[PDB]
Amino acid sequence: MANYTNLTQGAKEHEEAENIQMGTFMGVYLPCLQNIFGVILFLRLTWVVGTAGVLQAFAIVLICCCCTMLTAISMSAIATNGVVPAGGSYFMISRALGPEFGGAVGLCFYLGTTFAAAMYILGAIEIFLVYIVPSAAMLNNMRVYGTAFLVLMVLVVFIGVRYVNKFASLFLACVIVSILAIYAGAIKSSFAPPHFPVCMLGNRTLSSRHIDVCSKTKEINNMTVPSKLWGFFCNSSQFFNATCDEYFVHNNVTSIQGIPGLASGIITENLWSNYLPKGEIIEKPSAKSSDVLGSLNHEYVLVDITTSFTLLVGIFFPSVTGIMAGSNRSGDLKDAQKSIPIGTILAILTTSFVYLSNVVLFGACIEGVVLRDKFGDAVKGNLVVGTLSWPSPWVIVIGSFFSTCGAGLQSLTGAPRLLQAIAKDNIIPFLRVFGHSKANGEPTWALLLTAAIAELGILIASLDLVAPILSMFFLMCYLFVNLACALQTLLRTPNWRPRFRYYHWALSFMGMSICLALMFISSWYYAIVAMVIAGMIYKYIEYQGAEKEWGDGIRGLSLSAARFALLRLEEGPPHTKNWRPQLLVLLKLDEDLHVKHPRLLTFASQLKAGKGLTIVGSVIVGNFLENYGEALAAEQTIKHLMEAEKVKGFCQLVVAAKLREGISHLIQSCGLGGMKHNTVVMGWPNGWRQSEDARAWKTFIGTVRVTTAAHLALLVAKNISFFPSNVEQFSEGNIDVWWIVHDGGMLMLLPFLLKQHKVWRKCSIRIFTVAMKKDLATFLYHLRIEAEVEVVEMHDSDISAYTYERDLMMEQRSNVRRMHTAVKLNEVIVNKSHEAKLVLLNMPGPPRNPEGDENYMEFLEVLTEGLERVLLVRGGGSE
Amino acid sequence: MANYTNLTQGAKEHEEAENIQMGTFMGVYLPCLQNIFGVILFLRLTWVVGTAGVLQAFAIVLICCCCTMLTAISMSAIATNGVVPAGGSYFMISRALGPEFGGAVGLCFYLGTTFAAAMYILGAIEIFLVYIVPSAAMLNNMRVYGTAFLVLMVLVVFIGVRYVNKFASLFLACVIVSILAIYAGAIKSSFAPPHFPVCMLGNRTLSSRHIDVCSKTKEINNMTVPSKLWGFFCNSSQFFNATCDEYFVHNNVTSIQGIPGLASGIITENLWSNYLPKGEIIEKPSAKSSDVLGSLNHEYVLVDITTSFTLLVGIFFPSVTGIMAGSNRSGDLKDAQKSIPIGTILAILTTSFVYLSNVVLFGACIEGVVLRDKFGDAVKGNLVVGTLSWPSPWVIVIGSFFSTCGAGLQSLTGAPRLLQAIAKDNIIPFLRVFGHSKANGEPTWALLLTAAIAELGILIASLDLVAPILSMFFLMCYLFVNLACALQTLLRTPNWRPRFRYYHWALSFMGMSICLALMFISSWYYAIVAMVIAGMIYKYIEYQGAEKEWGDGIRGLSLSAARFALLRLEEGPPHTKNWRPQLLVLLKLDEDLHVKHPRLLTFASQLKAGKGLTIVGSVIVGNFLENYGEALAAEQTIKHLMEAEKVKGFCQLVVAAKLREGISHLIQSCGLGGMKHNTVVMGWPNGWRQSEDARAWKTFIGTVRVTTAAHLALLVAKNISFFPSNVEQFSEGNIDVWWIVHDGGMLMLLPFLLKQHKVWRKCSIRIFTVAMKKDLATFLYHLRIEAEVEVVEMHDSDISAYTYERDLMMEQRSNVRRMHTAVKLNEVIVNKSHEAKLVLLNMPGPPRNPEGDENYMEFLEVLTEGLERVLLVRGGGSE
Ligand SMILES: *[C@@H]1O[C@H](CO)[C@@H](O[C@@H]2O[C@H](CO)[C@@H](O[C@@H]3O[C@H](CO)[C@@H](O)[C@H](O)[C@@H]3O)[C@H](O)[C@H]2NC(C)=O)[C@H](O)[C@H]1NC(C)=O
Ligand SMILES: *[C@@H]1O[C@H](CO)[C@@H](O[C@@H]2O[C@H](CO)[C@@H](O[C@@H]3O[C@H](CO)[C@@H](O)[C@H](O)[C@@H]3O)[C@H](O)[C@H]2NC(C)=O)[C@H](O)[C@H]1NC(C)=O
Ligand SMILES: *[C@@H]1O[C@H](CO)[C@@H](O)[C@H](O)[C@H]1NC(C)=O
Ligand SMILES: *[C@@H]1O[C@H](CO)[C@@H](O)[C@H](O)[C@H]1NC(C)=O
């Protein structure tokens, strides 16, 4: 009907989509099903079940499948987010997680896939040599034939990948036919089990490669000649004065049915772990037994490796890997974000069900002794899982070989394409050599490097030792795929819109934890090494991207960190639950281009206590075309002054023609979007009456109006020459805060920040509210600093200039009276707080008409007449 | 002569210095020495030597001393940088590494100190019970006696810490007297070793708590009666047909000298590991032996714990811990930055030399069987190391007890002070409860919590099991102390001036790696838990600091990240090794407040390709007091447009009185210090001749002058309405870069940034140099980008207006002819490149006199007459 492929899509298809079909079943389901079902299912699942007991084997398969299922959910969350690139899964992961995580996952998954092509070559060799056509001799035969087979497969992939594309379907056919034959044998074996017997001497297990009859004697022509096994246990071979060993004269050889019915119920026997160390004779705890020992013969089938749980999880994990292959055909899809998630999750559920079913079936169908036989012995040298099959074990012996060769081809085509895809992205420099492609878009040097690493793997010619390394690399890939999603969801990374029905970051975090535990339990030895390798590749990719875009290595790294923080800061709720003053100190520069008020900087330092944001801005009057040198010089001056007063922050000079216009630009333009200020700190215009130009107060009131309009808070410090330095202290004093009807946020917050500095540490706080005891106490209760309160009420007209404003606020959603009431306020404040070290004091808004600006300044001067040090405060905003 | 103490200085002594003597020996040396010499030296060092073999014991002691020495170097680097606060080591660590690392190290060191108070109480109890005043019965005796002793010590430190301060000198005296007695015994054991014999049955060692003579029969009144050991190996006790077991009738009991001479040469025997598992009889591979077996008796000295290498390193590590106690008496110092590093490093060298010498002395003076005896058995119940002393083992057994109870007092004074110091800092909120102090400043709740944790430790009543947890916590403390230093030195963290003669960041990195390996080798399953607890405390402290200073949790967290990156960015070389265009796109806003040139944003996105910094700036002509609504509206519009054109960056609007002045402020004030732009991208003023207002081109040339004076690059795009979009592409085309005489760097770097985008991907590049050939080829080969070259030389007059300015540059570091030559340049440029897709072109500077601005604009206009899409480029800077 239709011809399809299971391979990956490298740069060949991505460059095609960059220059400018199949559904869910044939597109993202069958490739994943063909790539999860590996050699393990046929060569090591039985041994794992036997060695672990059905309970712990079920636990193993469940833990592995849960790691891989949470990784599938994270990978589907990656697939749905944004447009899915036409390339393989690597391109999806890159465009979804940034080039850093993309390169880390790419290299770890690549080493995984290479060592998988090695494991599959070892498995095909083991099947060909042990079962198809018959210690260290076996290992060296495997080394030699595996190297020959790898050279052949490398040539196959290099010359004729089109034929791999054509016969991927035949490979999947073989896989599914083998699995269905396993199930048909398992079901048939219930009523009619096959006649595969096993010789067993007492409770010690015998081999069957050389023995023919499970009897201590055979009778040819009614002659009690002793069986061949007598020769394999007694150095007499004739029974004539047979000097037989200890355990042989006592016990009984029995031909136990090796495949009992699924209804026979052997599961009660093998429901428990064995974990016997290396070289122990395999015992069935059912048959009779003597107690003498010693006769360690050559025919006793032995445990071939010191097995443990932590070892079994590693040996079995490479049978569930392959879910990144689910999306290796993502370019040829109709609805990517719909086909990929459902396809991957359904394929993983299918394979998990197949494994969890075969575990229990093997528990109930194969004898508890033939399971622990890791090389298909004791059954006349037949595949143990093969004994469960309807036609013959040869269908499995052939299907497994063809499937393992097909998976080797798939992973020897998927590894170099992935490596050249990582190379052409210029993510990592040194891999550029591997970008070299063939004419039709096929890798040349990547294939050679893949072959070299696969050979390095094959040098360890044992599946039982190649599986842990493969599992560790794939576990690192899955751990990063889960962690990147969890991180980008928590921190609210920009362009992280996971349009998935079931993805929650708790799933990805639980997956990261599960698979990290798997890594470390399997082998912390390899786990630390893999984590460090992946971390180094990650940091190196980040450094290279920095040096590529910003131009410097470490400079650009910090630059990128700052840019990313500010960007993340933009796509958020611009309001904050608490109000904190981020100061903009408007320093006044004299004609000497020297700060006319260092006390402004000292007080800003005292207010922020060296933490937070402090932008010190200043305007130089003149033309920028002919002042840039003076601008840089004054900037160095202000930076030295800031560093001298321990102010941590930045400086900005604007050369403008009009000081008023310069300030009106500074107030509204300082800071990058997100890092805006919300308070403007000014110095009082001393000697405003003594200036015949009157431009002092005009500029001051213009700045006040601009700050009020911009909705920023305002702190005008008056008599700033008396504000203390850093080195001196106050022995004792009182900050008297006069919190009028309005702006309780600032008037209550500032003295708390100020008393928190060492200079103002030894002073007390006195709130002389003029605008109730419990409500004010709550704020003090939260600030956790005792602050004596007191109320001094006066007439409304006395507070007219305030309450008028209040009315204007309410509706929003005479001069002689204002002056003589400012003098009444003066009388109270001076009589109560003359000796205060710092008097905070609320401000009225400037008049709506610009004519009363002189009157406004006279009002302020009166309101502050006689006080040693005043901090005029105005809220202005929301808070 | 003088009285001192070795305890810590908490917040009580720091608030004194905030409100407002000893040298090196008595100030930093003796406290560190008295705190490193713990109980291990006396109770488990001999056992470790025995069960490890002198070689591996030396390796273990060397690794521990190596980690502690590298951590001492990092801590000295912390101590020298800046002023040393008057508080304990915690205040130094905090002020040097920030509150996050300060709190993490504080809590890890505090858990360390609590479990150290527990280990020292267990050790004092073990010495009292086993050696001074005599399986699970012993464990329960230790539990109950340790709980009683802990409640006593807690009461002592709560009531009467002054007497502990007084007797710290007596405790140190005890330590030194004990160590000198050990050395004097080792020396006297050269000629005349002591008479401590051990009964040994062949090569199997016997106990001696109940035996009297190491003979099978003693003779009272000429009667060869059987010895008591007969009563312990033979259930006859009469010799009248005695039925003795297997091993006893064959072998011989011998009185082997237990302490041979130092020159005896027994070291050759115990120079190898034993690592025997649990319950194994201790075997001396020197004496004769039969081969019979079976006699498992009660008098065989048995290995009391399953020793291993990874267990031994953990059991021994808590004898090198305590280096932070060196600077726990820093407030009472004369020259802190000189006294702390020298004192700490000399103390660690002294203790390391003592340990490395005692390892070899124990190897070569004590029989290889008495060393592996972990409870001083087989020597009539005396301390193993005690047997090596000049007067008697009693001096050592009393000195060790007094030293260990003194160190218990020390750690129950040092742990709660450190906890109240971490509480009063309000670094971690929930610990605020423990901030309460006594009248004289002594912790009350902190002492109770320390008592609770120490009791939890004591409930595991075994030094051998408490030591790994203690060692893991101190290892985590040292790991953070080495990693924060490595990071702050590499990343150029502000205020990180390590004024030390020998501190190089490679040392701290090596220490970090060393004792990361130590953690994991000791117990990876404990170590991951410790790392995760420390990481959670670290991130929670960072979050609380963000919420405190900025006002919000996650928003403020990204804010802190951005501010810290910018600060770190300031104190660096302001130049960059590479130049990369960081664009300021100047969008001109029409009277309708709509973006007059979206193609500006499109081309900016194509130039930066979604990465880098793009500040889109625009000026709104008008008065700010009555326009802020329009400002927010236009800002939202420009932000939506930036998102529409795939531009990632920030938007700044300035409401200015004069458009020219607004742009002159924007060009010099955009961006925070460090994140400054370097290029200004402008749109050409189309229809300047048809708009009879002379201010259009005036404003344009003013912006050009401002850019040139600011030393920023300039990119004027002309005919921008026909520039492409993001969706469309080019089939085939040539980006022709016409590098006129100067400013080649940008003119060549731009077309590669352009062609690296999907739009311009399918175009070619042509460098039409006018004013060698191989010089370009080498630059392009270094950049790994190839293009097509062509050279078109012309007459000098034609480029006169250029060359003039070039000469004015070389000297630094008419108009009608200019127009007739711009027309000649036009001839050639069109004849070669008329049908190009994008013609880059260098620019001449604006005239010096602002009168010829009409002439300059006519020059430009004719130079670009007839070209489809021109990108005028001007260097301006260094590059
Ligand atoms: C296969 O047969 C051998 C030999 O009969 C079994 O070894 C023996 O197993 C029995 C288990 O009942 C052991 O008995 C136990 O002995 C210990 C020590 O004496 C005693 O404390 C227990 O209460 C129990 O009686 C016996 O020692 C052991 N023989 C040895 C170790 O030499 C073997 O267990 C059989 N395999 C299976 C799977 O049952
Ligand atoms: C302390 O004395 C006991 C009692 O003899 C020693 O145990 C025995 O040590 C001999 C050492 O030669 C062991 O012989 C060995 O047998 C193995 C197995 O055939 C062989 O491969 C070796 O070459 C060697 O001949 C013997 O098995 C062992 N008997 C036991 C353990 O029951 C013990 O070794 C002595 N300890 C030391 C430290 O010397
Ligand atoms: C072996 O078989 C014989 C006869 O079938 C039986 O008497 C004997 O008990 C068996 N041996 C054991 C150990 O059960
Ligand atoms: C025990 O000592 C006697 C005499 O001293 C000697 O004959 C005998 O061989 C010794 N036994 C062993 C096992 O060496």
Residue numbers in the entry:
A (entry chain A), B (entry chain B): 102 to 121, 133 to 246, 260 to 896, 905 to 946, 1028 to 1093
Question: What did the article's authors report about this structure?
Answer:
Potassium‐coupled chloride transporters (KCCs) play crucial roles in regulating cell volume and intracellular chloride concentration. They are characteristically inhibited under isotonic conditions via phospho‐regulatory sites located within the cytoplasmic termini. Decreased inhibitory phosphorylation in response to hypotonic cell swelling stimulates transport activity, and dysfunction of this regulatory process has been associated with various human diseases. Here, we present cryo‐EM structures of human KCC3b and KCC1, revealing structural determinants for phospho‐regulation in both N‐ and C‐termini.
We show that phospho‐mimetic KCC3b is arrested in an inward‐facing state in which intracellular ion access is blocked by extensive contacts with the N‐terminus. A unique feature observed in the phospho‐mimetic KCC3b‐PM structure is the presence of pronounced density for a short stretch of the otherwise unstructured N‐terminus, a domain that has not been resolved in any of the previously published CCC structures. Electrostatic surface representations of KCC3b in absence or presence of the N‐terminus illustrate that this segment is wedged between CTD and TMD and partially inserted into the inward‐open vestibule created by the helical arrangement of TM2, TM7 and the helices TM1a and TM6b of the transporter core domain. The direct contact with the ion coordinating helices TM1a and TM6b results in a visible obstruction of the ion access path from the intracellular side, suggesting that this domain arrangement could play a role in controlling transport activity. While this structure was obtained under K+‐free conditions, we see the same configuration of the N‐terminus in a lower resolution structure of KCC3b‐PM in presence of K+.
